[PDB]
């Protein structure tokens, strides 16, 4: 359902990483399958040849944390009036999600069950961000 339109209409795009994260650009192919593209280091940009109606999303390359592009989740290349700017930024994560990111970055998944915290938190830590789960949408 959430997939790229096969328009065959070229659209020049600039991916601008305005985040402190290494960015993984993800293209949703014609079958709705997430296709990863080369990573973007923190303060860098990239010119990419894309197409009108194509669907893109951006995640942190190492942890898969969700990022924003032009203040929303999905980027759709439009008609070049020249190139379309894709401003990738950190969202304002909730304090809980931000904490889970830090705890996950320090503790190996085998050891989440060794932390002195409520049971519901072990499940929240194990429920890592994921493109597939995010694809609902809906």
């Amino acid at each position: 359902v959430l997939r790229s339109v096969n328009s065959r209409e070229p659209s020049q795009v600039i991916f601008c990483n305005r985040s402190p994260r290494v960015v993984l650009p993800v293209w949703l192919n014609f079958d709705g399958e997430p296709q990863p593209y080369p990573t973007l280091p923190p303060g860098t940009g990239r010119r990419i040849h894309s197409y009108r109606g194509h669907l893109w999303l951006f995640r942190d390359a190492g942890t898969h944390d969700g990022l924003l592009v032009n203040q929303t989740e999905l980027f759709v290349p439009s008609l070049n009036v020249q190139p379309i700017f894709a401003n990738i930024t950190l969202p304002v994560y909730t304090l809980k999600e931000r904490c889970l990111q830090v705890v996950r970055s320090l503790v190996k998944p085998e050891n989440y069950r060794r932390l002195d915290i409520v049971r519901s938190l072990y499940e929240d830590l194990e429920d890592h961000p994921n493109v597939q789960k995010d694809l609902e949408r809906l």
């Binding site: 190996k108 060794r114 932390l115 002195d116």
Partner: protein, 104 residues
């Protein structure tokens, strides 16, 4: 330009923002509205340095670069009992526990 602060005295912390162009006196009027103590019964500090009333927050070193929402700058506050100002004293926050075996 907004500057983000922590006004601290003993075990009291006020989280507030002000303009870089606003004065030390204007900050004392903010403290007045909250703590109910007039500006003449107040002394403001940047570390151990007493701040002059007519000086702007920017001139006192509170800039957008250093007085951020996620990392606000500390302003020390001292009250006068009568007569005689009390020494500047800020109670430190609690100590975090030792990092658990799995985090190090």
């Amino acid at each position: 330009m907004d500057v983000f602060l922590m006004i601290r005295r003993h075990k009291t912390t006020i989280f507030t923002d002000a303009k870089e162009s606003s004065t030390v006196f204007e900050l004392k009027r903010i403290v007045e509205g909250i703590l109910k103590r007039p500006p003449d019964e107040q002394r403001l500090y940047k570390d151990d340095q007493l701040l002059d009333d007519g000086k702007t927050l920017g001139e006192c070193g509170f800039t957008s670069q250093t007085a951020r929402p996620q990392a606000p700058a500390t302003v020390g506050l001292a009250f006068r009992a009568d007569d005689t100002f009390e020494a500047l004293c800020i109670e430190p926050f609690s100590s975090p526990p030792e990092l658990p075996d799995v985090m190090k």
